[PDB]
Structure formats: structure tokens, C-alpha cells
Amino acid sequence: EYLEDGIYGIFQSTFLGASQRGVGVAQGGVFHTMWHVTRGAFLVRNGKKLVPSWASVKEDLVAYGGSWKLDGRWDGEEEVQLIAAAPGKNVVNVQTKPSLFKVKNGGEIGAVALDYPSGTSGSPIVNRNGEVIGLYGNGILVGDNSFVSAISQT
Amino acid sequence: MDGLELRKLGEVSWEEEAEISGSSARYDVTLSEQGEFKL
Numbered sequence: 001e002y003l004e005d006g007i008y009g010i011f012q013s014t015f016l017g018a019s020q021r022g023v024g025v026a027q028g029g030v031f032h033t034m035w036h037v038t039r040g041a042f043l044v045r046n047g048k049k050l051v052p053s054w055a056s057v058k059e060d061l062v063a064y065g066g067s068w069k070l071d072g073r074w075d076g077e078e079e080v081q082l083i084a085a086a087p088g089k090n091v092v093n094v095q096t097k098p099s100l101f102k103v104k105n106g107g108e109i110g111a112v113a114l115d116y117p118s119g120t121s122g123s124p125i126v127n128r129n130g131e132v133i134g135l136y137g138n139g140i141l142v143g144d145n146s147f148v149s150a151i152s153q154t
Numbered sequence: 155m156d157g158l159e160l161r162k163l164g165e166v167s168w169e170e171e172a173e174i175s176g177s178s179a180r181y182d183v184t185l186s187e188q189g190e191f192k193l
Contacts, residue, residue, distance in 0.1 A: 003160070007166055009160065011160070044158070057188055093169040096175060
């Protein structure tokens, strides 16, 4: 009834089967994932139905079953780690020196240059202490067409 | 087939031996109100 803390995969069921559409993180009784992964669709856990409790389209984040409980924030110089729950692949941790997105008429936010499939969207990015700094899956394509994601946090 | 189902695949942690990859660079981008990022 309380979702065990950890990384969960989002699975959608079609007439062609089950596919991992994305991932989220459970912490403190609430499920956190990227808004574009679910767009507010409800989840099910062992017959327990979860509905979105908060969402922000511009941050591309949505939470289920309570308020946003991920408190980690990037310091600006720590090496970061991406736990990548790619569809059909074993969970792997990848560490990187972060990139940066300078938004016009705004502020700085960190970014990670690691290219992972759709369905890895919502994977956690964490600092050396193991607290969650942001989620993965919202970013840009650069000149070589690789994907670069932002460390999406509230 | 009306909603999405959750499956646990692992737990959030920092692995000390984790493989390092990626490249560090600075990009200035625009952000729309719909959460879209563009260069």
C-alpha cells in the first residue's frame, strides 16, 4: 500500500504486448516521473490504482500519491551518476562530469550528455551521497544528433 | 489495458565503481512554457 522505495518501470499494455514506456522513482510514499512519460495517466500497483497528485508541464515532472519528495539539488561541481533503466537491459550506473544549459532570460541548470532510448525517461540522477538530484529524459539534440538531457528537478 | 503497471527494477544508489562516460560542454538553449528545450 506504500510503494517500496526504489526505481520502478512504467509498462504499457497493447494488443502487441507489454513495453517499458518509462521509469520513475519511489521515495517517501510518492512516485515521481517525467510528465511526458505518463501525461497524467494512472498507474497500478498489485491492483492499487495511483492518480497524479501534482504535475508541472514546464518542469516536465509529475508525482503520484503525495507531494514532490525528492529534495536533492545539484551543487554545480559534483560529478553525477545516472542510473539508467533502459528497456530490456540491466540497470547500470553511469557517472559523468555534468554539462550545462544556459536558458535565455533565466538561470543555469545542469545537463548530462548520455544517449539512452525512450523508456529510460524518468531515470534518477544522483550525487555522491546517493540523494536524487534530478530525473533524466528532457533535453535537446545537438549537432552530431546525440541526445543530451537536463537534470530535471523542482 | 486501461493504465500502466509498475515493476521494480532496482534501487537508487551511488555505485563507486560505476563506468564513466559522456562529455562536458556548455549549451545556451531556450525553454518554452511547455517544457520544450531548443538551441
